[PDB]
Structures are given as C-alpha cells and as structure tokens.
C-alpha cells in the first residue's frame, strides 16, 4: 500500500525553500504575566529543528 504520514508532525513542522525544517517554540500559550518581554521575544517566531532530532522528524513528515 501507500505510505501514510503522521498527522501530528505535519501540523508542527514544515519545510523552507532549501530543505530546512522549522517549528515553533514552547512556553508561550498561557501563564504570561510573570514572563518578561525578554522571554516572550526569545520564544517568538520560528527556529530550525536541531541536528539531533532531524532524522526522526524527517521520517515523520515523509
């Protein structure tokens, strides 16, 4: 049969134009009063999946 992909990893990861894999950062959905703006700006945006998780994340997206 045909290879299914993981519905959780497709909603948490995506690919850029050169094949990098990006994600969003945690600790930002709630409990935001005591977190200063130096912390919510560090946790804002996207970063690249680290080089030690890039093999399991690639074989969940595909």
């Amino acid at each position: 049969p045909k290879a299914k992909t993981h519905s959780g990893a497709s909603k948490r990861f995506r690919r850029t134009g050169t094949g990098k894999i990006v994600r969003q950062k945690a600790n930002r959905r709630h409990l935001l009063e005591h977190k200063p703006s130096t912390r919510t700006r560090r946790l804002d945006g996207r970063t690249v999946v680290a080089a030690n998780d890039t093999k399991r994340v690639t074989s969940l997206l595909n």
Partner: protein, 96 residues
C-alpha cells in the same frame, strides 16, 4: 521516545489556517522571455507552454528577474510591478 512526551506533542502547532480558495500562479521570469524569445513577438500563454517555461492549463504570472532587451508583446494573467517596467522599457506592451 520511551515514555516522555514526544517531539510531535511537546511543540505547539504551526499557526494559522489554509485558504481553501487560494488561487495559485505558475511563474515565468522576464529574463526567461529574453532567452527563449530573442527576437520578441507575440508571447501568449500557449507559446510559453510549448517552449518549456510554464505548465499546462494553469494561470500564468510574469515576474521580473533578469534583463529584457528583446521587444516582446506579452499576454498573460496578472503581471507584476517590476515586470511591467522592464517590458515597456524595451518598447513592448503587457495586456491581461
């Protein structure tokens, strides 16, 4: 991962929705109009398919990366902003 909450449940979901009604545009640069059509002429949506620069049965869109020195008369959907500037500088026109 052995019992801890995995990498596909620790991280938050990517934000947003997907537009169900999104209209895509296949893409030709204006520097490929120069190389494929070095003498210019009528450049339609059908002549860009056969010369191998855009796909079949899709809405086209002419963008503006390159150097256009040919005098072309290009007909396509949804021209760009820097593309109309380079086509009319070479004496051409750009209709929808």
């Amino acid at each position: 991962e052995g019992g801890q909450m995995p990498i596909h449940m620790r991280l938050p979901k990517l934000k947003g929705f997907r537009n169900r009604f999104r209209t895509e545009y296949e893409i030709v640069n204006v520097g490929d109009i120069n190389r494929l059509f070095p003498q210019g002429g009528a450049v339609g949506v059908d002549d860009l398919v056969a010369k191998g620069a855009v796909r079949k049965n899709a809405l086209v869109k002419v963008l503006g990366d390159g150097k256009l020195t040919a005098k072309v008369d290009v007909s396509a959907h949804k021209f760009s902003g820097s593309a109309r500037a380079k086509i009319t500088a070479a004496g051409g026109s750009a209709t929808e």
